[PDB]
RNA sequence: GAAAUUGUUGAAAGGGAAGGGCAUUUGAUCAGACA
RNA sequence: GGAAUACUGCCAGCUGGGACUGAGGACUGCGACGUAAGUCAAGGAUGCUGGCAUAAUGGUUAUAUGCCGCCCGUCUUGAAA
RNA sequence: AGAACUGGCGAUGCGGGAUGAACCGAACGUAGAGUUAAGGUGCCGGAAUACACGCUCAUCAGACACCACAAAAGGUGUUAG
RNA sequence: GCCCUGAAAAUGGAUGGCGCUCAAGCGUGUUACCUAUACUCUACCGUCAGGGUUGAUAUGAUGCCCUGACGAGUAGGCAGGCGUGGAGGUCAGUGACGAAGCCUAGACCGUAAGGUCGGGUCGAACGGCCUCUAGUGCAGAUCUUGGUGGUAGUAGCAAAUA
RNA sequence: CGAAUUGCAAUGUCAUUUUGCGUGGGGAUAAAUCAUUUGUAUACGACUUAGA
């Protein structure tokens, strides 16, 4: 028995894939996962974590 | 066919997980149903009672879906379904479906003998 | 000349157990002639057979043997623990097993 | 189509093992087994017999020759665990044992797979003991009985056989 | 180590003998317990008689032929003691109590067999000298046994034959020992003595 | 042409219930042969 | 006055027996011993021998035996009730 | 009957207290090996009819806390002061 | 301090029972031993987290692989799946050389929901996968309808003269 | 004089009740229940009587 400090088996509350079924968004996530994995620039990680957002977290600019 | 890639297929809990009081009543079948009751000794996991399915009883992912002969059983219905197995012979085992007639079973068995595939029921409607 | 035996006779006492819970995988053997855990340490690792009868003459004979071995020493009075390939069938509680000397260190 | 196919069928040709690191070393026998001692055989056709230990072989077996003229146990191998090494010795320097090895006892027969069908006396190379063997067996005990007969009662000892009596506690009694 | 063990139950304590018997007979040993009417039991006689008259009260109220059966023989008092220490309601305990035979006096099968003594149950070794004790024959006679005089008439009749067997055997051993000293001087004995023998 | 329920045959068990869990003996049955 | 031993602690001291486990699957690493080639107990088991090739062995099932096991659903602070 | 803090039961199985929702130990995937807790080691019942110093003989002795009842008042009974 | 009296309640009874008296009781101390689902190590399942791999190999990164920690649970929430009646595609799927159904202490796969095969019976239609849709899963409701038990060859078949 | 080749271990089987068959070697020649009957008995069985 372990006296737990934190809640066990806790998912991170961030989506790691788009909930969309879009093929051309699946391809952009395939591209920017490669770029974020194999470059050192944080721009690609920002663009990759921004491709996952929903319609109300992607407001029009 | 050496068929030896797999190692020592063991099976934790080879018993059946029958339903509680399936042997007491005839209306209660032996298909497993979780006891949802509030005073259920099976649900509260007492000593001497039956055991329920957990994920702890899961099989080794290397030796899962394998027969004791070491292959994965794949249902065929004709020779064009046999041709999907002709380059995976040591890992799969063809099995003729239950509704194939006796005239077509002697065709499927001859094609599988010519291709080297192992059929797991070559004595069905044999006559 | 009248004797031929190369074993020590012992009894199958019981399963390894608590009060109210028994574990059938480990049996307790009382080796006749042993009194302490030191000098019960001599028989550790030796083979045990349980020889019994049947009626189906299989492989040319009617007597059958369940093999096992001594594993450790039990509490304070020369009882030992034993493990068999197929466990002993609990109707032999109080039945003669034979402890051989097959892995020897003498 | 009674079962549709896998996504792309990962092919499972055989793959070689990793490089092991288990190099075999010579056996380290227990110190009570010096050549010339008298062993009590505990298992087999000649169990209970008292033999003389002559040589350590290279399949980790002992070479014993209780004199055939004494108790009829020929030159053979035992497993060094199914023996009890007694205290008594003989002088084993007189015998010549260098012609014995594992190919001396290797059987050059052919019954190596058909023991499931060999059940009605096949008469295949089973009962021929030639003069290559008994001639070598004569010289190793004609020089061994001449050392056994130096001490009194040892020949009767080796001709007798071992058994446990009713009070014999083997953890207490010596050997 | 013997197949059947005959226990001369004179001067043994009841529940200290019954524990050793109930362990050996469960380990698998065939035990007969002979001369059970001379069993001792600690505590003074009126204390044990009051305990037995306390036992005599406990019978089934609505039908007395269902209740605890108060057996009055000494062999059956010792059998009640052993049966309380064996799990007699299972097949293992039922099969273990079939390896037991208890008699008062010594019956003619066991008249001519060697009797043993359990030393961890003897009144002499276990009780303090000066404590009062009870004999099971007198207690059984006081609670309603009927054959104390019969097993006492059949006992000295056995003791006469045993004491006239022992005189013949004693004369045999004196005739053996008067002539076995003629060989204790020779070379075989002087060689046997070095080996301890 | 299912089940409750019943008859016959066959197998087995049965000292005030029966059924169930862990383990093994014994009987039946099946397995692949490593062919 | 000289010791010894008990007790307590330490050893990167030596050595004997027993039990359970052998996961992973080309190579890569850190070490050790060697002039070197290399070798090794150093990122998880190999070598030799024998038996059976099926009543070997294993699965299911019925029974026997040892130990355990109160009748489910519900309301309830609390149900075998 | 009504409150204060904590722990628990409810929602919780497991080893122990014979049995018990609440006490002691300890909280739970499926197995193997080892070691223990609380409790025990005459027999049921796995484990010392161990070892050491004393006390008690009870014509309803006494023996695991919760806990399953016990006082005032006596006894030159025995022991110690 | 121990023991006794003081100490009385109703079926027969309870240190759990037998039993125990230089204890198997009481006070105290020293060891050895027994064993929980607890602790340690290993294997496997799952969940969570971290990291590697679009060299380009099965264009797939849904995956594959490396490492570590964790796993109780009612009311309840969520997720991944199994099963049913119909619908749109597809397997140029199965079938009178036997579809569906039903029986089967016969076999295999899955932790499980369940799936597959063999044998018997049977006689005209029915499945796999990608999706759509719902009158979609029962052990209970003194549930509805139908059918059948133990009681049980039992209670009884005895007023009105024969 | 023999025992080797059960091949480096595989209980390596020897004991004792039940039962049936076969050979030869003796030996012995019955009752109980139903049905009928009695009434010392009796709800029915049971009991107690009688009958070549």
Domain locations along chain D: 6-175
- The CATH number that applies at residue C26 is 2.40.10.190
Distance (Å) from the alpha carbon of C92 to chain D's nearest alpha carbon: 23
Residues 6+ apart with CB under 8 A from D141: D65, D67, D68, D69, D70
- B59, B37 Cβ separation under 8 angstroms: no
* CB distance D46 to D70 below 8 Å: no
Distance CA E133, CA E12 (A): 11
Which subunits have 3 or more CB–CB pairs within 8 Å of chain B? D
Q: How many CB atoms neighbour CB D175 within 10 A?
A: 15
Count CB atoms within 10 A of the CB of residue D60.
13
Strands E30-34 and E4-8: parallel
Please give the residue of chain C at the shortest CA–CA distance from E28. Answer: C94
Q: Is D72 exposed, middle or buried (0-12, 13-18, 19+ CB in 10 A)?
A: exposed
Rounded Cα–Cα distance for residues B97 and B78 (Å): 9
D108-117 b/e (C-beta count within 10 Å ≥ 16 → b): eeeeeeeeee
User: Are E148 and E137 within 8 A, CB to CB?
Assistant: yes
Residues of D with CB under 8 A from a CB of C: 30, 32, 42-43, 47-48, 81-85, 162-165, 169-172, 175
In a 10 Å sphere around its CB, with 0-12 CB exposed, 13-18 middle and 19+ buried, how is residue D121 labelled?
exposed
Count other Cβ atoms within 10 Å, centred on residue E175: 10
Instruction: Count Cβ neighbours within 10 Å for each residue of B65-76 and write b for 16 or more, e otherwise.
Output: ebeeebbebbeb
Question: How far is residue D41's CA from residue E16's CA, in Å, rounded to a whole number?
Answer: 45
Identify the closest residue of chain D to C103 by CA–CA distance: D81
Q: List the single residue in E with minimal CA-CA distance to C11.
A: E27
Distances (CA, A) of B59 to B14, B26, B50, D9, D143: 11, 32, 20, 21, 65
Q: Which nucleotide is nearest to B15 (CA to C1')?
A: G60
Order of all β-strands in the sheet with D37-41: D76-78, D62-64, D50-56, D37-41, D83-89
Last residue before each break in chain D (C–N > 2.5 Å) = none
Report the number of distinct structural domains present in chain C. 1
- CB within 8 Å of E99: residues ≥ 6 apart: E25, E28, E29, E30, E31
* Nearest-angstrom CA–CA distance, D20 and D15: 15
Helix axes A23-38, A42-50, angle to 10 degrees: 160
Nucleotide at minimal C1' distance from the D2 CA: I128
Answer whether D11's CB lies under 8 Å from B90's CB: no
Instruction: Please give the Cα distance from B66 to E106 (Å, whole number).
Output: 71
What sign does the dihedral E100-E102-E106-E109 (CA atoms) show? negative
- Contact partners, residue D71, CB within 8 Å, separation at least 6: D49, D50, D51, D158, D159, D161
Contact D12 B77 (CB under 8 A): no
Using CB atoms, list chains with 3+ pairs below 8 Å to chain D.
B, C
Q: Beta partners for C50? A: C66
Q: For the purposes of burial, counting CB atoms within 10 Å of the CB of E37, is it exposed (0-12), middle (13-18) or buried (19 or more)? A: buried
User: How far is the C-alpha of A57 from the C-alpha of B8, rounded, in Å?
Assistant: 52
Q: How far apart are CA E93 and CA E85, in angstroms?
A: 10
CA-CA distance, D122 to D136, in Å (whole number)? Answer: 29
Which residue range forms the structural domain that includes residue C76? 1-106
Strand partners, E13: E40
DSSP D161: B
- Flag if C7 and D164 touch (Cβ within 8 Å): yes
The nucleotide lying nearest C19 (C-alpha to C1') is H45
Query: Which nucleotides of strand F lie within 7 A of protein CB?
Result: 3-5, 16, 18-28, 31-32, 34-35
User: CA torsion, points D104, D110, D116, D118, in degrees to nearest 10?
Assistant: -100
| D12 contacts on B by Cβ (under 8 Å) | 5, 88, 90-91
Asked if E113 and E17 touch (Cβ cutoff 8 Å), the reply is no
Q: Which nucleotides of J are covered by protein (CB under 7 A)?
A: 2-15
Instruction: Confirm whether any atom of chain J, the nucleic acid strand, is less than 7 Å from CB of D68.
Output: yes
C17 touches chain E (CB under 8 A): no
SS3 letters across E63-116? CHHHCCCCCCCHHHHHHHHHHCCCCCCCHHHHHHHHHEEECCCCCCCCCCCCCE
Nearest to C12 by CA among C55, C60, C70, C56: C70
Per the CB < 8 A criterion, the answer to whether A44 and A32 are in contact is yes
Chain E interface, best mutation among C12, C89, C94, by max E CB count within 10 A? C94
In 3-state terms, what secondary structure has residue D126?
coil
Min Cα separation B61/chain D (Å): 14
Residues in B lying within 8 Å of D, measured between beta carbons: 2, 4-5, 74-77, 81, 84, 87-88, 90-91, 97
Q: Using an 8 Å Cβ cutoff, are E135 and E38 in contact?
A: yes
C79: DSSP letter: E
Residue whose C-alpha is closest to residue E97's, from E105, E109, E108, E89: E89
| D72, D113 contact by CB (below 8 A) | no
CB contact under 8 A, D81 and C102: yes
H/E stretch holding E40: strand E40-42
CA distance E24 to D152: 46
Per the DSSP assignment, residues forming a β-bridge with C22 are C17
Give the H/E segment covering residue B74. Answer: strand B72-76
Q: How far apart are CA C37 and CA C79, in angstroms?
A: 8
Sheet containing E100-102, strands listed edge to edge, beginning at the edge strand earlier in sequence? E4-8, E30-34, E100-102
Spatial neighbors of A18 by CB under 8 A, at least 6 apart, are: A25, A26, A29, A51, A52
With contacts defined as CB-CB under 8 Å, which chain E residues touch C96?
A: 28
Q: What distance in Å separates the CA atoms of residue B42 and residue B27, rounded to the nearest whole number?
A: 19
């Amino acid at each position: 028995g372990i006296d737990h400090t934190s809640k066990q088996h806790k998912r991170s509350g961030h989506r790691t894939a788009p909930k969309s079924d879009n093929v051309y968004l699946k391809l952009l996530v395939k591209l920017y996962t490669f770029l974020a994995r194999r470059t050192d620039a944080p721009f690609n990680k920002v663009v990759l974590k921004a491709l996952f957002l929903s319609k109300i977290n992607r407001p029009p600019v | 066919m050496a068929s030896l890639p797999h190692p020592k297929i063991v099976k934790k809990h080879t018993k059946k997980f029958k339903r509680h009081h399936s042997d007491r009543y005839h209306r209660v079948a032996e298909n497993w149903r979780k006891q949802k009751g509030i005073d259920s000794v099976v649900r509260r996991r007492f000593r001497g009672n039956i055991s329920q399915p957990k994920i702890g009883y899961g099989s080794n992912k290397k030796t899962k879906f394998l027969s004791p002969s070491g292959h994965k059983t794949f249902l065929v219905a004709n020779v064009k379904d046999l041709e999907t197995l002709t380059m995976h012979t040591k890992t799969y085992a063809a099995e003729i479906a239950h509704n194939i007639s006796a005239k077509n079973r002697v065709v499927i068995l001859a094609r599988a003998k010519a291709l080297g595939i192992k059929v797991t029921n070559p004595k069905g409607r044999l006559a | 000349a009248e004797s031929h035996r190369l074993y020590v006779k012992g009894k199958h006492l019981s399963y390894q157990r608590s009060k109210r819970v028994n574990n059938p995988n480990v049996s307790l053997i009382k080796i006749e002639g042993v009194a302490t855990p030191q000098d019960a340490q001599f028989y550790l690792g030796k083979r045990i057979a349980y020889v019994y009868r049947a009626s189906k003459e299989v492989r040319g004979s009617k007597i059958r043997v369940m093999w096992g071995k001594v594993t450790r020493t039990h509490g304070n009075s020369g009882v030992v623990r034993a493990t068999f390939r197929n466990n002993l069938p609990a109707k032999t509680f109080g039945a003669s097993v034979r402890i051989f000397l097959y892995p020897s260190n003498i | 189509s009674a079962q549709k196919a896998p996504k792309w069928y990962p092919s499972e040709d055989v793959a070689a093992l990793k490089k092991t690191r288990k190099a075999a070393r010579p056996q380290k026998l227990r110190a009570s087994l010096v050549p010339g001692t008298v062993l009590i055989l505990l298992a087999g056709r000649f169990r209970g017999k008292r033999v003389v230990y002559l040589k350590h072989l290279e399949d980790n077996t002992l070479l014993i020759s209780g004199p055939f003229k004494v108790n009829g146990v020929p030159l053979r191998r035992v497993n060094a665990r199914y023996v009890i090494a007694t205290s008594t010795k003989v002088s084993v320097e007189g015998v010549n044992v260098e012609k014995f090895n594992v190919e001396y006892f290797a059987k050059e027969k052919l019954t190596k797979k058909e023991k499931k069908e060999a059940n009605l006396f096949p008469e295949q190379q089973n009962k021929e003991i030639k003069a290559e063997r008994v001639e070598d067996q004569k010289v190793v005990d004609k020089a061994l009985i001449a050392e056994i007969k130096k001490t009194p009662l040892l020949k009767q000892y080796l001709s007798a056989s071992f058994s446990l009596k009713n009070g014999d506690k083997p953890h207490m009694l010596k050997f | 180590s013997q197949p059947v063990v005959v226990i001369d139950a004179k001067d043994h304590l009841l529940g200290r003998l019954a524990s050793t018997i109930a362990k050996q007979v469960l380990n698998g040993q065939k035990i007969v317990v002979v001369r059970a009417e001379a069993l001792n039991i600690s505590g003074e006689f009126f204390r044990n008689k009051l305990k037995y008259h306390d036992f005599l009260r406990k019978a089934t109220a609505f039908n007395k032929t269902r209740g605890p059966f108060h057996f009055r023989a000494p062999s059956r008092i010792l059998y009640k003691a052993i049966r309380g220490m064996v799990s007699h309601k299972t097949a293992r305990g039922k099969a273990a109590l079939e390896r037991l035979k208890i008699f008062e006096g010594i019956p003619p099968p066991y008249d001519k067999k060697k009797r043993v003594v359990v030393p961890q149950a003897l009144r002499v070794l276990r009780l303090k000298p000066g404590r009062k004790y009870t004999t099971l024959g007198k207690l059984s006679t006081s609670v309603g046994w009927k054959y104390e005089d019969v097993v006492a008439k059949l006992e000295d009749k056995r003791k006469v034959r045993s004491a006239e067997y022992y005189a013949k055997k004693r004369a045999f051993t004196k005739k053996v020992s008067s002539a076995s000293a003629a060989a204790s001087e020779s070379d075989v004995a002087k060689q046997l003595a070095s080996f301890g023998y």
